[PDB]
């Protein structure tokens, strides 16, 4: 059954099939002459490319020093004549060979290169290239070329990061930022490096800073008393004119509090030692497994708040001055050289990794199967289809929402359902919540014509070991499709316990966003 493993919708033949390849450093010039060959699944031996040059870029780092090496480049490889791209529904070679009726006793990619396979599944092309979804959470695909067929490729250079001779991996990430800059963080790290250096020296030569630097006990102390110094040093340091903009964007969000920079400074001091502090790979390595970084990065609530070269520089500068105060209080090394040197370099690298994550497309909390985590609860659509509300027909549809809580028993007061009378109304009887098997019916009631409210008949609690599934049933009386202007809200509001938000008693709202389709 070829229809069982080959996704024909995504399979096709084209003239001059082109793709991209991430080229490690030192291989940029050599690869521009031809594709040449040098696991537990011998079947996938082959040359790998991708339909996305930006993803391809990601693969241009030293496999030796993966965290903080230098970048190589990206090349565009093209096949002359016709090439068949056979997209696959699975990545299990054994299962593929069975369903495709092949030699179960030989590697898969080698059979993909034989004329027998190129004849049968080739639909005309000179060679075949396997195509599998790049990864979970992406639209890009991964092209697996047969080693033999791949010598036929024509390599042309697209970008060369090493050629830009830029610090760390700046060139590489500057390139990837283009993906969205056609949120979208497109920063100039050179500028950020400049501003940071300038500010670190300015802070050091500031009266109050020096003044506070003296109040430092300067020898190892308990981390409880250390934080208190750093927090005070923080408040003081943040007063400096150079850091004016940080003082402002920082005063509101708790994540960005001085206590947070303080605990961060201490964490760093505790894990870096003379050995580590000397090596860039080793440092970045230690730093990357520490919590509280969003505090210095200005990342919280699904957003990168430190969106400018100016603020980014100010945050790193402050973090570096703090780390320098922290080292003698609980560290064990050459007290400061690290803070303005390696620490800045590693941290800059981590910022770049996280910024890259936010620039990439993604589903927000409550969308598709992504959980929405709020006030101790964790809700999400059972499946992607559940998040999709179809229209243009008369009839029912049901929607499952997984709900649970982190620990102690938390209530579920009821649920708010957006409605469009005639095209989308709540089926009051096919709608319920089941808590650990207990199917509990709900008392629904159209508050407005815009929203119905359903409340469980018997109390509903969720927690560690107590999960529930809310089943929203919709009914359509008109076979006319819902029109955009009609959509007054695109989410289902599950209500938790009663809290006090800005002086008003309201219930915790956990949102499950949906999409109207068909």
């Amino acid at each position: 059954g070829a229809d069982d493993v080959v996704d024909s919708s995504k399979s096709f033949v084209m003239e001059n099939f082109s793709s991209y390849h991430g080229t490690k450093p030192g291989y940029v010039d050599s690869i521009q002459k031809g594709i040449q060959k040098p696991n537990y699944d011998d079947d996938w031996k082959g040359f790998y490319s991708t339909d996305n040059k930006y993803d391809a870029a990601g693969y241009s780092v030293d496999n030796e020093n993966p965290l903080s090496g230098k970048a190589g480049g990206v090349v565009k490889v093209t096949y002359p004549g016709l090439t068949k791209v056979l997209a696959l529904k699975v990545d299990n070679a054994e299962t593929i060979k069975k369903e495709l009726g092949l030699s179960l006793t030989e590697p898969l990619m080698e059979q993909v290169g034989t004329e027998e396979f190129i004849k049968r599944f080739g639909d005309g092309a000179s060679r075949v290239v396997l195509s599998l979804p790049f990864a979970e959470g992406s639209s890009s695909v991964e092209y697996i070329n047969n080693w033999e067929q791949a010598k036929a490729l024509s390599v042309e250079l697209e970008i060369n990061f090493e050629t830009r001779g830029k610090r760390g991996q700046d060139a590489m990430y500057e390139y990837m930022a283009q993906a969205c800059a056609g949120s979208c963080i497109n920063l100039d790290w050179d500028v950020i490096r400049d501003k940071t250096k300038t500010k670190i020296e300015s802070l050091k030569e500031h009266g109050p800073i020096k003044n506070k630097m003296s109040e430092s006990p300067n020898k190892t102390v308990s981390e409880e008393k250390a934080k208190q110094y750093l927090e005070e040093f923080h408040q003081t340091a943040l007063e400096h004119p150079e850091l004016s903009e940080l003082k402002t964007v920082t005063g509101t969000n708790p994540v960005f509090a001085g206590a947070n920079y303080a605990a961060w400074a201490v964490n760093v001091a505790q894990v870096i030692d003379s050995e580590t502090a000397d090596n860039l790979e080793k440092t970045t390595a230690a730093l990357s497994i520490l919590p509280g970084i969003g505090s210095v990065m200005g990342i919280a609530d699904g957003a990168v708040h430190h969106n400018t070269e100016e603020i980014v520089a100010q945050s790193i500068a402050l973090s570096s001055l703090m780390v320098a105060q922290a080292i003698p209080l609980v560290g064990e090394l050459v007290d400061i050289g690290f803070a303005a040197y390696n620490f800045v370099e590693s941290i800059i690298n981590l910022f770049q990794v996280v910024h890259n994550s936010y620039n990439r497309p993604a589903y927000s909390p409550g969308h598709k199967t992504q959980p929405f985590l709020h006030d101790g609860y964790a809700v999400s659509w059972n499946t992607v289809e559940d998040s999709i509300i179809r229209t243009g027909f008369q009839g029912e549809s049901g929607h499952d929402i997984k709900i649970t809580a982190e620990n102690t028993p938390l209530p579920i007061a009821g649920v708010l359902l957006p409605t469009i009378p005639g095209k989308l109304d709540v089926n009051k009887s096919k709608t319920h919540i089941s808590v650990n098997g207990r199917k509990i019916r709900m008392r629904c009631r159209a508050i407005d014509g815009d929203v119905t409210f359903c409340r469980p008949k018997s109390p509903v609690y969720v927690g560690n070991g107590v999960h529930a599934n809310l089943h929203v049933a919709f009914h359509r009386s008109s076979s006319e499709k819902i029109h955009s202007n009609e959509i007054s809200s695109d989410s289902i509001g599950v209500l938790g316990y009663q809290k006090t938000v800005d002086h008003t008693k309201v219930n915790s709202k956990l949102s499950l966003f949906f999409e109207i389709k068909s």
């Binding site: 508050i447 800005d502 709202k509």
Partner: protein, 41 residues
Amino acid sequence: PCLRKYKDFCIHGECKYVKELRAPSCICHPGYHGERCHGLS
């Protein structure tokens, strides 16, 4: 009650007093979230 007492409570959403629970609510506009529909995402 949304007119008088709970006016301006809801930011990016429509206020609807939920009688049963004796409290207002905010039906967040497309893409917004929050008890007061303060944020987008």
